């Protein structure tokens, strides 16, 4: 279902953390990876969505990394894309 989509998003989330250089914190990345393997494995959307909320929190907990407000800025200037 969308269980397909939460798994794709999760693959992309990991890759984002990747490009913000998280592996140089061998334990945050450990957690991320495991959170990532957990949901690709998920057999119902709930567990998945729950492990996905934890994974995203790592992003959102990173200070300089992503400013969502500046992101959402360009989100609305390119509403087409």
């Amino acid at each position: 279902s969308k269980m397909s989509d939460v798994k794709c998003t999760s693959v992309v989330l990991l890759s984002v953390l990747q490009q913000l250089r998280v592996e140089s914190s061998s334990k945050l990345w450990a957690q991320c990876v495991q959170l990532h393997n957990d949901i690709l494995l998920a057999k119902d959307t709930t567990e998945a969505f729950e492990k996905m909320v934890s994974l995203l929190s790592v992003l959102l907990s990173m200070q300089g990394a992503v400013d969502i407000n500046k992101l959402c800025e360009e989100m609305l200037d390119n509403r087409a894309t």
Binding site: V6, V16, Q31, V53, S54, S57, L60, I68, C72
Partner: protein
């Protein structure tokens, strides 16, 4: 660096689109919250007695998210254990108040537990 930045740019842009489209209450909570300056200090923990920490910048945010001892976050319920002000000093739930909120040291930090 310039070209790789725009890569990471496209990738991050596209990620929240994957996220938006997923339209799920728990994520949207933590994304929207994050937008107000309300962010988690550690990994949101799935379990029950593993601790959560978040920053509350606003008395608004406080009102929208706290209510007595319960802390509504990430489409589940949390038990406000302790709150501290910007100065690392303890704040009692009853100082986070109508009338007193402008004398507090925002932002505050809630350590809550899952129900």
């Amino acid at each position: 660096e310039d070209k790789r930045a725009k890569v990471t740019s496209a990738m991050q842009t596209m990620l929240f689109t994957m996220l938006r489209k997923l339209d799920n209450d728990a994520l949207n909570n933590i994304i929207n919250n994050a937008r107000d300056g309300c962010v988690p200090l550690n990994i949101i923990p799935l379990t029950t007695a593993a601790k959560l920490m978040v920053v509350i910048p606003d008395y608004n945010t406080y009102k929208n998210t706290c209510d007595g001892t319960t802390f509504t976050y990430a489409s589940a319920l949390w038990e406000i254990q302790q709150v501290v002000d910007a100065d690392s000093k303890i704040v009692q739930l009853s100082e986070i108040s109508m009338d007193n909120s402008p004398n507090l040291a925002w932002p505050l930090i809630v350590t809550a537990l899952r129900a």
